[PDB]
Amino acid sequence: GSAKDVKFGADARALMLQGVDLLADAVAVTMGPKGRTVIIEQSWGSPKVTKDGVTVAKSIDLKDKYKNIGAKLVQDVANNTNEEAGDGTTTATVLARSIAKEGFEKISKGANPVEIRRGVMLAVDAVIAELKKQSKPVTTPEEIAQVATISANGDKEIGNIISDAMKKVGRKGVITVKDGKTLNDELEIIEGMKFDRGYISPYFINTSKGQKCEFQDAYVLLSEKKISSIQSIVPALEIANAHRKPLVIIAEDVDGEALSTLVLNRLKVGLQVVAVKAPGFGDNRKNQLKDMAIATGGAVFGEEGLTLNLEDVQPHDLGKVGKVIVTKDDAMLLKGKGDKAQIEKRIQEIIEQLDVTTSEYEKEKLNERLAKLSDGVAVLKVGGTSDVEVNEKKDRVTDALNATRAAVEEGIVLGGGCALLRCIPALDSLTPANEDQKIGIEIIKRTLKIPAMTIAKNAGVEGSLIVEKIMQSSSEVGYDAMAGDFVNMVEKGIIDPTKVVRTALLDAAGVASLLTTAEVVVTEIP
Amino acid sequence: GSAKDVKFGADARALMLQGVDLLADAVAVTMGPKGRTVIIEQSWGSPKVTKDGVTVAKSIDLKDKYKNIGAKLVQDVANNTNEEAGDGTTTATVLARSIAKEGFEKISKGANPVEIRRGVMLAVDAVIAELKKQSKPVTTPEEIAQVATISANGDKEIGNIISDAMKKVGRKGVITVKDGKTLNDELEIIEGMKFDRGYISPYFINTSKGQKCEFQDAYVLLSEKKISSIQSIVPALEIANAHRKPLVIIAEDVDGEALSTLVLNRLKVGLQVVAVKAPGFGDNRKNQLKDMAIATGGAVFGEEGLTLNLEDVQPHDLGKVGKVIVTKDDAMLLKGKGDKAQIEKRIQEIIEQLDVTTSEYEKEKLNERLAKLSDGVAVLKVGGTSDVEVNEKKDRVTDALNATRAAVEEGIVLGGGCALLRCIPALDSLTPANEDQKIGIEIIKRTLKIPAMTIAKNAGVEGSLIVEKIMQSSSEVGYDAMAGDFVNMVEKGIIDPTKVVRTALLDAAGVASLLTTAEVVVTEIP
Amino acid sequence: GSAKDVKFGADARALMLQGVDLLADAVAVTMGPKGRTVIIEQSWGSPKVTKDGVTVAKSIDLKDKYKNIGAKLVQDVANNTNEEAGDGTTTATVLARSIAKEGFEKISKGANPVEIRRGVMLAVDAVIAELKKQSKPVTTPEEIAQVATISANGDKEIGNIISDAMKKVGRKGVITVKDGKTLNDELEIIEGMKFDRGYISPYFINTSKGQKCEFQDAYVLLSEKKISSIQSIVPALEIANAHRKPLVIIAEDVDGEALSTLVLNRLKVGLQVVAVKAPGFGDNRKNQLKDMAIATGGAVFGEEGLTLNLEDVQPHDLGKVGKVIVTKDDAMLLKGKGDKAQIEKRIQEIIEQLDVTTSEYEKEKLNERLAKLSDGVAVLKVGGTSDVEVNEKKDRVTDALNATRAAVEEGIVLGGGCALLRCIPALDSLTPANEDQKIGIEIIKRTLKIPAMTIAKNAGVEGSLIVEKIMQSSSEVGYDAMAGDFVNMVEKGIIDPTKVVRTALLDAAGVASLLTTAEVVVTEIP
Ligand SMILES: Nc1ncnc2c1ncn2[C@@H]1O[C@H](COP(=O)(O)OP(=O)(O)O)[C@@H](O)[C@H]1O
Ligand SMILES: Nc1ncnc2c1ncn2[C@@H]1O[C@H](COP(=O)(O)OP(=O)(O)O)[C@@H](O)[C@H]1O
Ligand SMILES: Nc1ncnc2c1ncn2[C@@H]1O[C@H](COP(=O)(O)OP(=O)(O)O)[C@@H](O)[C@H]1O
Numbered sequence A, B, C: 001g002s003a004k005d006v007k008f009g010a011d012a013r014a015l016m017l018q019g020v021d022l023l024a025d026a027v028a029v030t031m032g033p034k035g036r037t038v039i040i041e042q043s044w045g046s047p048k049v050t051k052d053g054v055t056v057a058k059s060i061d062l063k064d065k066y067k068n069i070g071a072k073l074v075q076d077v078a079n080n081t082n083e084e085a086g087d088g089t090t091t092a093t094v095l096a097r098s099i100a101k102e103g104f105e106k107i108s109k110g111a112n113p114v115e116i117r118r119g120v121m122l123a124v125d126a127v128i129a130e131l132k133k134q135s136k137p138v139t140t141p142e143e144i145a146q147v148a149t150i151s152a153n154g155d156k157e158i159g160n161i162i163s164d165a166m167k168k169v170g171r172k173g174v175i176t177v178k179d180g181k182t183l184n185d186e187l188e189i190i191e192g193m194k195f196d197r198g199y200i201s202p203y204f205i206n207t208s209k210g211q212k213c214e215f216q217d218a219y220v221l222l223s224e225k226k227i228s229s230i231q232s233i234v235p236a237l238e239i240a241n242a243h244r245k246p247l248v249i250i251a252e253d254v255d256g257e258a259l260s261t262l263v264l265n266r267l268k269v270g271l272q273v274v275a276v277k278a279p280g281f282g283d284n285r286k287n288q289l290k291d292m293a294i295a296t297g298g299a300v301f302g303e304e305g306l307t308l309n310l311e312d313v314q315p316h317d318l319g320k321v322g323k324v325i326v327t328k329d330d331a332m333l334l335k336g337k338g339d340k341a342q343i344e345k346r347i348q349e350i351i352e353q354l355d356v357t358t359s360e361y362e363k364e365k366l367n368e369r370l371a372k373l374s375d376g377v378a379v380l381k382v383g384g385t386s387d388v389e390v391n392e393k394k395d396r397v398t399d400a401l402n403a404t405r406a407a408v409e410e411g412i413v414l415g416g417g418c419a420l421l422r423c424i425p426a427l428d429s430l431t432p433a434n435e436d437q438k439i440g441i442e443i444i445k446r447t448l449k450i451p452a453m454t455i456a457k458n459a460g461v462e463g464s465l466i467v468e469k470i471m472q473s474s475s476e477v478g479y480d481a482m483a484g485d486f487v488n489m490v491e492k493g494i495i496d497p498t499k500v501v502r503t504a505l506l507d508a509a510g511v512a513s514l515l516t517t518a519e520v521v522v523t524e525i526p
């Protein structure tokens, strides 16, 4: 293969550690309320500004291949943490560096770094245990706004708006975040099954106020093929006029004589029908119409395999919806009836789809919003006066969102970094098997102090003074670095979801303790 | 052809030896419980971490073409050893370097390196004989867990889970290894003939609990062609309703009018049929349907050669299975009846296929799990908090698995480097034909000491003191380098499969003794 | 054309001689029992090691274009020798260098290098004459094993296995050599006409043991076209059931109604038929079916030109074979009856084809292997623990094979190099026409001493002492360089085929004596 070059021992370890230390030093300035932003040049456009540890970490590759190895591993931890939890990234980086440094330094000739890794992992199990003991599950929706506001770097309006969206859509409902055009944040809530397709003809309009087609207790007909009728529609219309309910028709298109029958029966003898084009496009539209089929009940017509033909319809082959509103641009269907079991099965199918599949073909999420819209969905249109502002802010909002979900699903624990600090005594009651493992437990014991000392150091204060003052102080009190003084933590609102504190530590220790095991490094020649 | 450059004798030999020594020095740090890991830069992704000798060896090519010649030969050794045995790679490397060095040093004028090669080969035959004498075939399934745990670098949970899988699937059954998404290891066991294809229609569902089609004592119909026509489907159903058993149908597809008959007779008579698509890849599906044919007892319809047509079926042309379960995604068939002779025939055929040169289109293994699945198969989903961890661990698990298979199929012998150490007296009772052969036997005699010296040296202790203390000590006792003291080897669980100890030595000596014969090296000019 | 640069006289001669001397010096280390190997870097893979003079010679091109001219001429010599004889390559190289040096040195102003060439050519004619006088044709098959073992550099097992294959296949039979996967050598012998195609239907099987169809005294039907019949098949069956003999059918394919007739007549009334696909590759299969036609006695049906149609058969248009065995994978036909004149005519045709057809679409040998000997064909599966070893050993066995064939077809003469040494007195009784020719005869006279002195020099001893000791000693005695002492040559088994000794010398002198005639050399600019 490619010509290569290799390096041995503490020299190579010092190189990789130089890379780790550089990347960590770049990431760590973002930490906490008094933390600061990092600008990253974009190749094509105007530069990014960010406070996100992981996005800083991903941006830094290094010319020196060994230092780049260190860097790659540290961004690996930060990325793993962002994927598994969505916050706690800077923390995962500073922990990873601490374990890597304190690890590397303790290595000698007699030492056994794999066994030291074993000791470290013992220490991490033991700490996350005590963390779970410390966790108190969230209750009041004030705590939600608190977790959001701290994860959003002190922006109260963010955690308020997140609290509102999470109330009105639910704690495990769908909230999504995107650019506003407004200079301010907006919360919009959609209910139903909305998609961007409108009536084919104006003649379908009934209300004259808004120019909408508005129906209730309606039927829905779903056709995967075009309907340029062979009069495959008429039984479907006779069945609708029979049970005196309005009919909405969704199809690849409604065309030719079909439409003529539709707006003749519409303009004359006032029949209640509307027809709209399928959401589109191509193979996606199949999945969408089958989604709406399963949600609203009934069955999709046209060729899948077993072909259900439009000539032979029955009322159990249509669909049933509480309400329908359609305009020139979009169509919304509301309170559609079908098997809820089948709906939760369906969303469980799409999430397990999207989760394994990775082309940034984001429509799989556009599916998920649609079929989950019968609880509701919230769109978070973030404001600001400029694209870069909008992107930084949106990074923070997404962080706070993921943080609130982690808080709701696992728990909350003390903020600042105190939650890890309180776990040290649990390490003090450990029973190491040998010197190596003892070294590992010592490494974790030192590493736990880091996040709090870093948040304080960013403030411009003597962080390690503050750590020890906190340790001397009672369990409920910690350091408010923004206010610049000690306070009850939970009362003042400084709290972190337990899941992120768990995952940052577990990932960071997980890769760094492996990094410390290295004795030989092999890299490509420039 | 290409312009070239040539070098003569011990000058060139010292260069090739420099390459050998570099690669060996890189590989050798991994050896034993106190061994250490090697990081390798990947071109596209985050870097590999490994303890595998062969994967370190393959990663190192060299700019200096002569040193690269040495390197290529040593990685040839490690790769051959990994292919033939699946462990014992680092050992093969350090052995190969020892034979290459001690070889090169002993050549002079008048010396006959070919004849010396003959002597070392004599010595290796003589060693492997005594190794086989030392071999004690495995008995208790504790010994399995011991071989696994030592080959997995002291991870007891690995050898436990391997012991469990090997118990529940059998010692020569199929175990495979794959990534978990879980942070912990999982053992899954599959029974049957599973493949990833589901019922064509929901209407086939029987239980409403799980939404499965569940059958017992059923027949199976196997069609290599599509089944659209009624004409070829109906007799197969009349014969099925005749003997009052459920029928599963596997086909390239089942569609047209056939499907309509299927879900009409399903919904009315309440006939017990299910239909599923063939596992489905071009020419592969033929081999799969032939597999299920042979397993379930019976024959495949459509065109091979002899075409048996679907219109003329007989009960002995179908298939017969104890149970069958189908879902939207997958189909499992269980306790299918056919000639065990013929299925063992099929498995003996596929292994002897796989054994040759169709490369890494590994569905050939996916076949083999299927037709061997009526004993069982085990999936080993290994955990960890990060991809690099998962890959290192999976390397170790695969090592331990191959090691356990080597143990069960051959014998087991003392661990550490002791198994080779005890063979030295067998060299002492040799009768060399001439000085050259005597030099060879001396080379092997020195080389046998090496693995123990390396395992001890990695521990941070005076390895060659330890070797001689071991030689002074009794046959049953050796050095526990992890615990840092001498112990009975077999009692403490430190044991190596004889196959790997045999293959490492045979390959290493095999290539290195050839390397020492070189007098002139010819390389391309830069 | 391309810009060029030219050089005049002994200056340029010294450069070309530098190239010759370099390549020769590289080649000559391989010579004799105490000879040594040469490693050659491969562009794509792991490096070759070889003891083959020609493979060393072809590997060396040179940057200096004049030296490269010399090198190209010497590798021309070694290649010509390898093509014409298959051994004696190193010898041809050192001879060529000796003639080139001794040639170049003796030229002056008054000298006439063309006439000197005439003199050396006289001397070599006179030498090969006396060589043919010395030749004693091979008799005992011990001598075969001796020639093989010596040409294989002392590996007795090689010459044993070659002796066995040559006994069991005949002295002018077909032996071929290829890689084993086994660690040891294997001799396999195939008899018949085997090819890799199996019965179209399992129903054709006769013996439940092995699952074969076994026939004797059978007919053969050969169809170049498909038999989807049309029932052009039936007369061929009526004619077979008439004379109560089994029928094997070879065709492009046999299927449609034909196959149905075949397996109905097989499964009900106990008719003895099999049908198998043509060996099958486009235009190749045509030639193969014509081969089997000619061997089994009878004719191929379908389109050549004159079309013989399947409807009009006669028993003399079929084929007749002593025995036939068919399986799922392969078909073997044995003791087929036809004109031996016509078959040897056919073999004489294909050899004269392949010989001119520099195509490396080498299946023409697969043809030659198919149209079988007398006594059969032998496959030599060479073992070893590694690919490079296998390539070395296979090079040596190919050498020994070619050497044994040269021995049986021309003769054997004294080994060591003595055979050329004994020819010197024949030169002493020559009658040179002029000084130039006398110089030529002197050149050959010195050159004859070289191979023996070189084999001794590789041993580490005073080669030129040994040559003169040999010359003072009797005709039957020479130097055993492996045992390191003088012995009866033929008695100790050290012998060389006369053909290789002839061809090495003739080629070497042939090219080198032309090289010495040069006065100006013209080369391209870098
Ligand atoms: N006023 C505050 N006082 C003390 N700690 C705070 C305060 N505000 C935020 N933090 C801490 O800052 C950390 C979050 O830092 P942040 O910049 O979001 O990095 P990350 O991306 O790792 O979450 C949390 O652990 C939280 O406890
Ligand atoms: N505690 C121990 N004491 C002594 N030898 C050990 C111990 N653990 C493992 N070994 C030895 O280490 C060797 C395995 O080393 P390993 O890193 O797997 O190299 P390889 O990949 O070449 O097998 C085995 O020969 C085993 O006997
Ligand atoms: N034991 C021996 N004693 C003396 N000469 C030997 C012995 N073994 C081989 N030879 C000589 O070595 C020569 C063969 O050398 P080899 O390496 O095969 O060169 P080539 O490839 O040109 O044939 C033969 O001429 C043979 O006589």
Ligand SMILES: [Mg+2]
Pocket (backbone or CB within 6 Å): A087, A088, A089, A151, A152, A399
């Ligand atoms: Mg954050």
Ligand SMILES: [Mg+2]
Pocket (backbone or CB within 6 Å): B087, B088, B089, B151, B399
């Ligand atoms: Mg191992």
Ligand SMILES: [Mg+2]
Pocket (backbone or CB within 6 Å): C087, C088, C089, C151, C152, C399
């Ligand atoms: Mg030879």
